[PDB]
Amino acid sequence: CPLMVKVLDAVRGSPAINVAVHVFRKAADDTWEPFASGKTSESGELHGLTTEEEFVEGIYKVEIDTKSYWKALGISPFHEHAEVVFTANDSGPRRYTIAALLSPYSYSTTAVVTN
Amino acid sequence: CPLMVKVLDAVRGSPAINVAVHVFRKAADDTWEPFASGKTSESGELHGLTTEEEFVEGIYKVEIDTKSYWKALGISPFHEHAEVVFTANDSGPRRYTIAALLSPYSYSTTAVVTN
Amino acid sequence: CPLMVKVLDAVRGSPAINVAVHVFRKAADDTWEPFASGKTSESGELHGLTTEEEFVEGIYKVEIDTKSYWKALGISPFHEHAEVVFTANDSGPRRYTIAALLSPYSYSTTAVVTN
Amino acid sequence: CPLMVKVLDAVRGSPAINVAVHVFRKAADDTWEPFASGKTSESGELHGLTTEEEFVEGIYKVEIDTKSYWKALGISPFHEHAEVVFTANDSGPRRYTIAALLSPYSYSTTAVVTN
Numbered sequence: 001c002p003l004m005v006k007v008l009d010a011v012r013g014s015p016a017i018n019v020a021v022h023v024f025r026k027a028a029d030d031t032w033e034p035f036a037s038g039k040t041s042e043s044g045e046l047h048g049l050t051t052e053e054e055f056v057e058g059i060y061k062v063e064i065d066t067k068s069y070w071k072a073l074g075i076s077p078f079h080e081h082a083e084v085v086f087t088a089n090d091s092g093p094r095r096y097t098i099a100a101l102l103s104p105y106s107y108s109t110t111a112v113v114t115n
Numbered sequence: 116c117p118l119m120v121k122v123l124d125a126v127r128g129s130p131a132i133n134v135a136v137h138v139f140r141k142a143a144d145d146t147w148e149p150f151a152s153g154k155t156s157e158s159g160e161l162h163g164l165t166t167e168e169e170f171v172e173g174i175y176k177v178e179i180d181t182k183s184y185w186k187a188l189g190i191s192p193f194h195e196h197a198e199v200v201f202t203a204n205d206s207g208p209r210r211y212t213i214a215a216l217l218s219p220y221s222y223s224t225t226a227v228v229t230n
Numbered sequence: 231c232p233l234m235v236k237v238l239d240a241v242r243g244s245p246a247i248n249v250a251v252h253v254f255r256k257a258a259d260d261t262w263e264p265f266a267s268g269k270t271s272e273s274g275e276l277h278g279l280t281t282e283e284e285f286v287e288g289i290y291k292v293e294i295d296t297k298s299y300w301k302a303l304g305i306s307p308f309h310e311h312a313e314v315v316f317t318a319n320d321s322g323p324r325r326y327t328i329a330a331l332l333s334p335y336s337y338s339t340t341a342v343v344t345n
Numbered sequence: 346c347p348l349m350v351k352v353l354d355a356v357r358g359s360p361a362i363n364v365a366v367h368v369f370r371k372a373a374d375d376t377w378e379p380f381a382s383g384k385t386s387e388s389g390e391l392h393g394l395t396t397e398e399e400f401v402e403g404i405y406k407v408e409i410d411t412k413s414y415w416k417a418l419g420i421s422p423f424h425e426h427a428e429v430v431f432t433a434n435d436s437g438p439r440r441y442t443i444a445a446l447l448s449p450y451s452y453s454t455t456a457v458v459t460n
């Protein structure tokens with residue numbers, strides 16, 4: 001599990017459950033191609049998106065559908081989604097955790113990169 | 116100024132100066148078209164991006180070139196850029212201020228919508 | 231104004247208005263003594279807290295009454311208040327801006343030190 | 346383990362290791378009395394501070410010594426420490442995770458509260 005996504009809700013102080021997540025990888029032709037997708041679990045975590053074999057050097061985009069999330073809680077949020085864009089696996093393979101903390105008009109994202 | 120961008124640097128505790136900012140508007144074929152751009156001023160702000168006449172309802176993307184900012188300071192950054200995607204919507208006469216606070220492996224962004 | 235405070239609301243995407251702010255200076259017996267206070271303005275800002283003559287080097291604490299702010303909006307908050315503790319130090323002629331971005335279970339704060 | 350503390354470094358994108366943490370509990374006489382203390386582990390987490398028997402209703406202060414942390418990395422940071430102040434265990438016992446994300450001039454803190 002070289003790529004993991006974790007989402008917290010800053011209004012409720014709890015994991016953000018059932019948040020859709022789509023990952024894309026920048027193609028040879030500069031296009032965003034579909035790489036992996038998942039929903040967060042009761043702990044707000046999404047494991048198993050990829051494998052170290054699949055997850056090669058590349059520019060990746062992790063899209064967290066925060067608008068759907070807030071709307072289901074009756075909140076009409078500012079952002080369409082949270083987008084995280086980064087180069088992965090230059091120094092060789094690493095483990096990436098992409099965290100986001102969500103509020104209706106604000107979010108933050110941090111990466112924790114290992115080995 | 117219906118739309119303003121403000122960037123701060125969390126490592127140095129200062130406005131983030133000379134950061135390039137590109138704004139796009141989503142067009143009918145779901146493609147991003149270039150709408151407005153500039154670089155932040157000594158105060159970390161970018162004013163004069165658009166006019167009320169131009170700024171119509173629609174989905175906009177604001178892209179903050181964080182990677183180049185960190186590179187020109189010698190600091191190894193994680194993200195390619197910071198992205199903010201939102202729907203501008205009447206109701207109204209709102210000023211949108213898109214603010215962002217930058218660290219090498221983390222950013223936050225918030226929208227302040229007034230008047 | 232050598233010291234300014236600025237608060238934003240991440241749930242509503244607006245300045246945080248009428249938030250009480252207390253500033254203290256640490257005295258010789260390691261006790262906090264009341265230095266300056268006020269409430270944020272319609273723009274979420276609090277100016278005029280001190281003067282350059284008064285603001286000498288020392289350890290200061292800035293306490294933002296977040297709990298009362300959330301309660302007057304009906305939202306159940308986690309923190310009693312947000313606290314910022316720092317050493318003011320010459321080098322210099324700096325303006326200190328203490329900014330804070332508020333959610334019910336989360337806050338961030340940043341210092342912007344200029345001139 | 347009803348109280349856990351987790352600290353991330355936003356400059357390095359890694360857990361913040363060996364960060365001292367002190368917890369206080371507000372006494373009957375309005376004084377902050379010493380409750381528990383610990384250092385974060387290689388994962389940036391601090392477990393075992395207290396027990397559900399010990400950890401009664403109260404107002405608590407979690408002090409994270411961020412200045413020592415940054416100074417050991419050669420950074421002279423803005424803040425003396427991060428202070429998190431909250432009422433614990435009104436609805437009966439809960440599980441509290443206090444997270445902080447650190448930068449030299451900025452930090453954020455979020456609580457995740459369970460059961």
Ligand SMILES: O=Cc1ccc(Oc2ccccc2)c(O)c1
Binds near residue numbers: 238330
């Ligand atoms: O403290 C956390 C934090 C505080 C404020 C921020 O944005 C602004 C900074 C200064 C003025 C207005 C907004 C922000 O992005 C993060």
Ligand SMILES: O=Cc1ccc(Oc2ccccc2)c(O)c1
Binds near residue numbers: 444455
């Ligand atoms: O303090 C602000 C803050 C703290 C933690 C965060 O991510 C995590 C939350 C809990 C555990 C681990 C990481 C975060 O995104 C913001």
